[PDB]
Structure 1
Amino acid sequence: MQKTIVVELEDRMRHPLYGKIIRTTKKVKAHDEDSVAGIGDRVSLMETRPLSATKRWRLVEILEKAK
């Protein structure tokens, strides 16, 4: 996506009525100042001002890239 990365975040939280911990996943967009990120790739993010219609995040650094 040409200086843009897509990151699948995930977070777990109780069900309000039943109490089971439900795991869900999001898909946010982020900005690569240089296009170095591929499929896999644990990445750390930080949220910013609006950079496009959908980009709200920036790539900080890559820790333990795609094995």
Structure 2
Amino acid sequence: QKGPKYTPAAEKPRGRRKTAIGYVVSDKMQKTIVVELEDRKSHPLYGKIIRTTKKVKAHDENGEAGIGDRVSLMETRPLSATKRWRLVEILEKA
């Protein structure tokens, strides 16, 4: 009774990652950009709808995004402190 030298493991499916879409408001830096993300929640006590915005640091390699443009974004592994967001594709420009 001789067994094979290779024993394949279980193919763990690759997991999903958070995806978001927002607007770029400044690109003065090099291959980095600002995108604002908007969220809506109900106040736990009063129930009011409250609008909030976030500032996130995205990753780029060519600086193809102009000011005041809608863009799609994605999650990546870390590259710089407080910079943990990545570009996928641009959607709207003006």
Q: TM-score, normalised by structure 2?
A: 0.67
User: Which of these two proteins has the greater Rg computed from alpha carbons?
Assistant: 2
Which 4+ residue blocks in structure 1 deviate beyond 6 angstroms? Answer: none
Deviations 1:8-53 (A, max 9, x none): 1110000010001110000001011111112111011101111101
Structure 2: tracts of 5 or more residues without a match: 1-28
Measured in 2, the distance between the counterparts of 1:18 and 1:10 equals 21
Measured in 2, the distance between the counterparts of 1:2 and 1:33 equals 8
Percent of aligned pairs sharing the same letter: 92
Measured in 1, the distance between the counterparts of 2:33 and 2:83 equals 9
The structure carrying a bigger strand percent of its residues is 2
Measured in 2, the distance between the counterparts of 1:38 and 1:45 equals 15
What's the secondary structure of 2:47's corresponding residue?
coil
Alignment correspondent of 2:44: 16
Q: How many residues align?
A: 66
Structure 1: tracts of 5 or more residues without a match: none
